[PDB]
């Protein structure tokens, strides 16, 4: 492999985190959005991305998010997003560098195939590793890079903008049969905040204002009928949020029960959706109880949080208490049949200083390894087998 | 386009239309299953002989045929390295859409640029004279499509040259 | 983008943040650039003090062409001892900044512009020596041919600035000539790059851009570079020549001309990549034309009425 | 399927994409009681909509929320849209995309509030706003022509050549069937009959819809009526008393050809059509003259197509064939062409979607619906 | 692992092509002599300018077999050389007077010619294909699809 | 068979060597839509070329890639060449050697770039670039004469004696049919007709082709047209409107004899033809005067050969005969002569072959062609 630093690109549904292996942060963290125009033809040169795309809606560009619900679904826009990432922001030559890419555990064979042909034929990268994204978020949880600080067994709950998935990993191996996914994350709680501002007919219900009300005003409560009652009993529970309009004037928004009812989307997904029903503490139980019996203590002892939509105030404490309730009720059913007390299991949900970008920090830490260039597809593999080299699922069991 | 291609595309049309006498046929090697027999080859009595129609050493058809399936594969004009790149990538976008063009393969057979599989079900559920019209209209136009793409590539190479060289 | 930025965008945004910031956090950031260049940005002793260091494989050649003198002239009191594994370094102290937002902005710009400033010294050496030769040729126009013939060999700069590009340049009394001994090693970029290099030279023959530097192209080397060490006439290099005349490096235009000529092969490389995205949209547009030729084989049938989620509907 | 809602100034016309005709067609009216509600219970309501307002009208003040193609009252327009979805079509609007319509040269805010109410009040999955005359050209089976569309509140001319609209040549005229109804009230007053209330304005609209017609030569018809009983005929009011009228039958529609009858300084609908053709580039004019398409209820008068052809033949050079296309279904051509458009497969990519509105706000309509 | 071991190829032997098509009732040297008598007649008919009689005589016998590729390719060299020397105006009058078996042999050997363009001129074989299919119909190609694999 | 193209400055003439006339003759034009397509499912194309651009011109801006015999837009020229091959002649460019054609005294870059595009973009097997005036002698059956060739973009004189050209006596005049269309648009304005757009220019080109002629004595014709309406004619626009035309009917073509009408300091076509003969060696002049050949569309005006013989007879010495050969097919004589040349057995070693180009580069054309 080349001696140049690998380039790390976590392309999320909400945000892309771009940087180089071994740095103390991503070089860029900006929305996974493209601004596109809607006698020589140049409208495919005229686009913008990230923070510079958000500035272009008033100039008549159509904004789009080429990743939705965790999966790339517009390969024209994702190719233009990557070329602009590589040549504007990272300012790099693909021929000199190995790349770490990411996508959700479910992601189609078709997506890794389409990713490999853009990377090896459009850009001609030296080599590509498409990582299992929340497996990197386990490695970001270490107290330091030294081997004695590693905890190679843990459940990881990743919750970004587009999807939340719970991954069991034990001794560094991903138990792919036990992956659970909930199709609801940080964007669906924004659409719920937006919908509640809109039901009150508030002066502003733009998407940025609903987003900023999540980041600043929202938190996870114990129980929504007790918390609705606390919003009768105590008057300063309602906040006032000052927002500036697209046409440049002030507004003031009263923010109310969406402060607790919007983060409740994870703990009662029947608020968000007709199609998904199991709450996150029961969904994490289903991951560990489908997983092999000898790893269950290790998977409960280390439940790592990952992705921006896990950062709600009191989120890890609600998950820990509700999962500890599920776990001890199941252990006590067995103690009451057997007539003897167990040792129990400690359920620990872990929030940590790198939790916001744990996939990128893990990708950086794993791409720093001396062995890394041997796990990549090299362009010499792609010259023989084409994009079919990337098609086989890494995380799940394959037939053949 | 068809003055130079006319003798060739008439031979392709006539023999593709002879070859599409397809039928429902279940497997003799697997029970309660049917498979496109040209694509599996496990029972040779229901394979018809493979026929090559050719204009040139570089411009060729292979027609492979069976009781319930035809596989049709083509080599297309690539007279320079720009056309070798442009053809390969155009066929990859076209075969990437194969679920919506129901008679496309997702991969060509080795040594061919694009390939088609017409099965019994396609001759039952689609107008088979319009299937062979789509094959011949694809063969008639693809050389004009690819040559126009190398005009667009020339036109962009001029755009960046004039934009660059005019800001001294 | 139709054109590349000249400066490192990360260094510009980071310094524009830290020069404004109320409370600077620490940093430890290795940052890549084009042509194998790399930067290290860090706070190695205090959060208050940022060290920016450049690594560049041709820096020893550039020092022979007066680079340290230009970097001391540009960065002044901020110049620092080189960091280990880096060729040049600058220390900026966040409590020692200029008194205005506009001086801070042009300092954040100046430090982001550092790759093109280290690489500008051979071009300033050629422009300032052309002004000496211009004055001598203005003194005696019949001695000028011999001054130009000796300056073509005695005042030539070659920079082997990456393993597949040599930039060669020299002054004569009315011009600076610069030759890019240029190559693409990736085979699809060599094929598209032949079209880009051909249409580049043919563009300069059209009436609309006669105001530009003269351009010439070949794939043996220009006569006056044939015996420069590391130029080789069979080794798949093309040779793009620019003749900058006095009007292309007039005092209002020198620094833009330097910035813009250094990025030549980088704009060509970038546009050879971006042309693939253009070809791909050209392709999938006529995949959608060929759909309509297959759609005429679908026999016409009415589908049942469905709601937006695809659930069946029972009305009309 | 998708809803098509041609919410015009005088009638709401609504239904489903791919249907032969609108299955909901009702007055674009909200009615509110103007009298002492003395009996307790009695099935009384705070307001009434459409055919319920039109049948109760003797006790209601009637008002249209839309005038000259512009929504003037959004609270009553939401009341009308609610009546379309829940009462008249009997659908969940959150299950169906909706194709809406408006006249050209409307206020920008009309399109914005119309998209906002569809996504935020009615929770629609997707919507689009079409120009009404562009819809009427699909209902003609044509891809070139000039469409003269005249409804209740607005008349407009849109020229289209080979699917390209010429937006500089588009004409609007804020004169249509409501101005003709108001003028029929003003001239009925001269023969002896006063119609004054918003309820009596519906009686004289019904007189206009079956007594009135367009004369081929107005001064000959005016002289023929001034000298004979033969143009005179009668109508019976709800009260059973009889109205007889004569030259009022063709003087009312003549206001489309002579807007000065209502004090307007504008060309008539014939000369406005010719002025739109003459604003188009010289090569397209021949095919516009051969394709004058009539639309909307104010084009339903007897003799108006024969008059329009006579008048445009005098303005155009004699060297070419003027043809006026006036289908018997032209009462609904905007809705018919909306049901064509909403059923096309490329149009399925042209919708503004819920997700795309939520990301962009109501300004998304100005950069997607033209 | 067991999944990849081919048991079917040894436990259930499939039909061979000679179970479908009857064995050739002539030896390799017997057919090689029979063709070696015809090729000199086919060459001689070109020199007298009677290439139509050159085909009518060459077409009176056809070699087949996987044991005879050398004499099959020599017969195909003579067939394409004969077809290249017939004038394009004579083809319609000749095709309508061929038997169904002679037509079946012509459309079979123009197909063997079209399979190898670096040896054979496709332009004349496609001209013959157009005229033979125009006059005798689609069924002549259907007989080639159905034909023996060692022709 | 070879291909032959006169890529003229106004028409493409294309076809096969040994045929009697061009197979394809069409406008050397690319048209692009200026308006927005409002109608879904229409056959909307990114650009149109030739007769399809000319047919659709009311919605297109029209551009010619060739100006004054120089290719100014290489992308639109490549669109025209692609249209000649794949749509008009419908043959693949790799299959036939192509005879292209050019005016004398062109930029050397025009011929090199034309050569590079045929060999590397269209991958032609062999090609040649002939001088248009040399081909006009092949069509005329001559090996001696002076050709006055005048197309859409350039007028030129080439004197040839017994197969030898005299390249010092060659004359170019960047004034031909397009400059006469520009001037007819300008002098139509003074009778009150406004033609401005790129499509109205094509109507004025048709007015010039249908009605203009060369007046044998301009001041007697100006006095005649001032005295009576007998010189006036009428033309009907695509709008069905009629325009009537008088002295501007012959004052337009007089710009060939009086270039100062369009403000340019140069000799008229008679004086450039005489100056070309007077640059030749004294013994050949006597035979050049008898062998004036006229070619191209701008030589098609009624009366131009009579005017041209009158003016050359006034310049030349009266002791010897002036004869001008202006044949009725002269509109296609460059192509006809290219079909003759590419058909000669003695020409088949004169092609630039692809194998001979890619050992020399596109400068091969300057040593294989005149
Ligand atoms: N403090 C916070 N509290 C709650 N949600 C947050 C917070 N900070 C960021 N988010 C939300 O996290 C999501 C982005 O997380 P990220 O991990 O970057 O998602 P992704 O990788 O899928 O694009 C957005 O919905 C964002 O608004
Ligand atoms: N038969 C008719 N004769 C005259 N006027 C008619 C006729 N039918 C309808 N109208 C008039 O047309 C108008 C309604 O037409 P419509 O196209 O539905 O308008 P809108 O779309 O703007 O609501 C009313 O003024 C109505 O009285
Ligand atoms: N009958 C005519 N009378 C006058 N001018 C003509 C006539 N026919 C054509 N033209 C002019 O000549 C041009 C075409 O002549 P042509 O010889 O084909 O020119 P070119 O080779 O440059 O394309 C037309 O575009 C028009 O300007
Ligand atoms: Mg994410
Ligand atoms: Mg209306
Ligand atoms: Mg010409």
Numbering used by the authors:
A (entry chain A): 2 to 39, 66 to 427
B (entry chain F): 1 to 168
C (entry chain D): 1 to 219, 221 to 317
D (entry chain O), F (entry chain Q): 6 to 375
E (entry chain G): 2 to 152
Article passage:
Arp2/3 complex is composed of seven protein subunits and nucleates the formation of actin filament branches on the sides of preexisting “mother” actin filaments. Elongation of these branched actin filament networks powers eukaryotic cell and organelle movements. Like actin, Arp2/3 complex is an ATPase. ATP hydrolysis and release of the γ-phosphate from Arp2 and/or Arp3 regulate the turnover and mechanical stability of branched filament networks.
A 2.7 Å resolution structure with ADP bound to the actin subunits in the mother and daughter filaments, ADP bound to Arp3 and ATP bound to Arp2 reveals several functionally important parts of Arp2/3 complex absent from lower resolution structures. This structure serves as a reference standard for the mature branch junction. All 8 actin subunits and Arp3 have well defined densities in their active sites for ADP and a coordinated Mg2+ ion. The map shows clearly that Arp2 has bound nucleotide triphosphate that is consistent with Mg2+-ATP, although incomplete occupancy of the γ-phosphate suggests that partial hydrolysis and phosphate dissociation may have occurred. At 2.7 Å resolution, Arp3 D-loop residues 39-57 are disordered as in previous structures, but we also visualize weak density for the D-loop C-terminal region (residues 58-67) in the branch junction. The mother filament is bent where it associates with Arp2/3 complex in the ADP branch junction. Arp2/3 complex binds on the convex side of the bent mother filament. The majority of filament bending (~1°) occurs between subunits M2 and M3, while the remainder is distributed between subunits M3–M6. Most of the twisting is localized near subunits M2-M4 where bending is observed, and the cumulative twist difference is ~ +0.9° over the full range of the bent filament segment (subunits M1-M6). In the branch junction with bound ADP contacts of Arp3 with the mother filaments bury 187.4 Å2 on actin subunit M4 and 393.5 Å2 on actin subunit M3, a total of 581 Å2.
